[PDB]
Amino acid sequence: RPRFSFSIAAREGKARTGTIEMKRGVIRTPAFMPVGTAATVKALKPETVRATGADIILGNTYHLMLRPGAERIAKLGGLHSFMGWDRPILTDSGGYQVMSLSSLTKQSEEGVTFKSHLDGSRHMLSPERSIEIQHLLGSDIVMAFYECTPYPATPSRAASSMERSMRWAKRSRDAFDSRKEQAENAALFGIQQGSVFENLRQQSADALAEIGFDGYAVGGLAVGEGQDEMFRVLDFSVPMLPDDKPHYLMGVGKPDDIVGAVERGIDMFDCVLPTRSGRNGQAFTWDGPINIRNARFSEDLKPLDSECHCAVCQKWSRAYIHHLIRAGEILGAMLMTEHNIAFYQQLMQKIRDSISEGRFSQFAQDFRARYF
Ligand SMILES: [Zn+2]
C-alpha cells in the first residue's frame, strides 16, 4: 500500500533479507530482477516471468525512448499496461547504454547528445529528460541519471566523473520532486560512483546521503575489474551507504557473484545473463552451467536440472531442448530462458531462507563447493 517501505526481517553478518513494499507490490530481498529490454523479458510472457517467482523486472530508458518512444508509451497507457506486467518495474536511467550502444556520443555538463544506433538519432539525454522519460513509462523505481566511469580509470578521471554524477544526482532528485504524481507514487534511487577508490566512493556516498534517496545503487562495477576487485570494492563501499535503505548492485548476475555480493550487503540485482545465455544454449544448474548443445545431451532424458522446480524441468528433457537449440527453434530459447530465470529466482529464495534461518554462511559455502 505505501509508496515505498523497506523492512529488514533478518540479518547475518552483512547479509540481510526483507521486503520492499510499493503500491504495485511487495519485493522480497535479496531480489533478482529479470531484464526487459524492449518492453519484453526476451522469449517470455509476463505471466511466465511472474510464474518463475519474480516480484519486479527492469526496463531500460534507452531502448524504449528510441522504440517505440517514451511519449508514445505514455499515450498508450504506460509500460505496465503496454507489456502486460502489473507489478513493480525499475527503470535504468539510460546513461550506461547511451555510452555503449550509441553512435557519436557527446558528453557535456548539461547531459549527453548521441545518435541512435538504428535510425537517425533520437538525440538528447540529461538528468531531467531521463527522469521525465521514466515518468512517462510509469516506472515504480526511477534511477537518477549518471555519467559512466570506464575500467580502468585514473583517480582524477574517476573523481571528475563521480563529481559530475553527484551533481546530476541532485538535478535528478529535483526533477523527480517537481513532478508530484511521480514523487507521490514512485521511488528514486541514487547511484554511488568512484571506481575502485574508496575515498571517491566515500565522497559519493556522502553526497548521495546528503541529497537523500529511497535506495542506493553501487555503480561502476562489473565493467571489467574482475570478481576479486568487485568484491574488494563492495567490502568498503556498501558500508558507506545507509543501512536502512536497499543496496542495489547494477548489472551483476553470475550466480557466484550474487551470493558473494549478498554476503557484502547487496539487496537487489539485475543481469541479462539468464535470458541471454539461455538463447545461447547455456543452462544454469546447481552443479554449474552446462551448454545444452553439447553432444553428450543428445539422449539425456533428465531435466536441465534435477532439483529445479520450474515447468520446463517438470516437462521436458535435456535431449529435447538440446535438439530445439541446435535446430534454432524458438521454443528452445523460450524453454532455456524460463528455466534460467526460474533457476535465478530459486537461488534468491534459497538465499533469503538461509539468511532468515541464520545459515546463509553455510549455504554460500555449500553452494560454491557444488557449483564449482
Ligand atoms: Zn528448471
Curated annotation (Swiss-Prot):
Binding site for substrate: D92, S93, G94, G95, Y96, Y146, Q193, G220
EC top class named in words: transferase
Record keywords: Glycosyltransferase, Metal-binding, Queuosine biosynthesis, Transferase, tRNA processing, Zinc
Protein residues bound to Zn(2+): C308, C310, C313, H339
Superkingdom of the source species: Bacteria
Keyword tRNA processing among record annotations: yes
Pathway assignment: tRNA modification; tRNA-queuosine biosynthesis
Signal peptide: none
InterPro entries: ArchSynthase1/Queuine_TRR (IPR050076), TGT (IPR004803), TGT-like_sf (IPR036511), tRNA_ribo_trans-like (IPR002616)
Named cofactor requirement(s): Zn(2+)
EC code: 2.4.2.29
One GO cellular component term: cytosol
Region ranges (RNA binding): 251-257, 275-279
Molecular function in Gene Ontology: metal ion binding; tRNA-guanosine(34) queuine transglycosylase activity
Known catalytic reactions: 7-aminomethyl-7-carbaguanine + guanosine(34) in tRNA = 7-aminomethyl-7-carbaguanosine(34) in tRNA + guanine
Gene Ontology BP annotations: queuosine biosynthetic process; tRNA wobble guanine modification; tRNA-guanine transglycosylation
Annotated Pfam families: TGT (PF01702)
Function: Catalyzes the base-exchange of a guanine (G) residue with the queuine precursor 7-aminomethyl-7-deazaguanine (PreQ1) at position 34 (anticodon wobble position) in tRNAs with GU(N) anticodons (tRNA-Asp, -Asn, -His and -Tyr). Catalysis occurs through a double-displacement mechanism. The nucleophile active site attacks the C1' of nucleotide 34 to detach the guanine base from the RNA, forming a covalent enzyme-RNA intermediate. The proton acceptor active site deprotonates the incoming PreQ1, allowing a nucleophilic attack on the C1' of the ribose to form the product.
NCBIfam families per UniProt: Q_tRNA_tgt, tgt_general
Subunit structure: Homodimer. Within each dimer, one monomer is responsible for RNA recognition and catalysis, while the other monomer binds to the replacement base PreQ1.
Family as reported in the entry's similarity comment: Belongs to the queuine tRNA-ribosyltransferase family.
Name of protein: Queuine tRNA-ribosyltransferase
